[PDB]
Design a protein around this nucleic acid. Structure first.
Ligand SMILES: [Zn+2]
Length: 178
DNA sequence: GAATCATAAC
């Protein structure tokens, strides 16, 4: 350990970082949030990747989903913000993590095309879809072509308009806040 | 000049 890819693991242990906790999972704030509200849900049981998912994890997934929603209500109930819950198709960090993220995407840590695409393309597998996928197939189906999705031209998730750069995309999103 | 991209990080 000490390796950056182990980061999350260390952070889940730290009580200070623990936003929520129960016998199955733990919820922490994303250290480099891509929105005003960005949490990660992590299971205590070590699971490497989604490629290692079978029906025995089904309930756990559902739990993770549930907890996610609860976090919203508990820490963003006063918020009018839309939320999405899902996983990245190809994760960089070890240990599976559910993204719970507000759809404002108002954050200085959202810096490049890869970030934006990671949250606003098929690369972002919604939790619900994943859950049904396991229920129906007992396995997670990942369509090929994921890395390329990260290179697609910037497009607003709100008005579906094309944008030429991150600064411009941000300036554009600013006005959707109202 | 500004933003993006490519690559290393000892
Ligand atoms: Zn828009």
């Amino acid at each position: 350990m000490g390796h950056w890819s182990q980061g999350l693991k260390i952070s889940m242990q730290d009580p200070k970082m623990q936003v929520y906790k129960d016998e199955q999972v733990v919820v922490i704030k994303d250290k480099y949030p891509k929105a005003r509200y960005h949490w990660l849900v992590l299971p205590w049981t070590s699971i490497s990747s989604l490629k290692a998912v079978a029906r025995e994890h089904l309930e756990l997934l559902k739990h993770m989903h549930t907890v996610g929603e609860k976090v919203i209500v508990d820490f963003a109930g006063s918020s009018k913000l839309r939320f999405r819950l899902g996983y990245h198709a190809i994760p960089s960090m070890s240990h599976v993590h559910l993204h719970v993220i507000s759809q404002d995407f108002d954050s200085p840590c959202l810096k490049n095309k890869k970030h934006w695409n990671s949250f606003n393309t098929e690369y972002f597998l919604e939790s619900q879809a994943v859950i049904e996928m396991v229920q129906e197939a007992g396995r997670v189906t990942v369509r090929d072509g994921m890395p390329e999705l990260l290179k697609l031209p910037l497009r607003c998730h709100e008005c579906q308009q094309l944008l030429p750069s991150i600064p411009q995309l941000k300036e554009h999103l600013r006005k959707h806040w109202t």
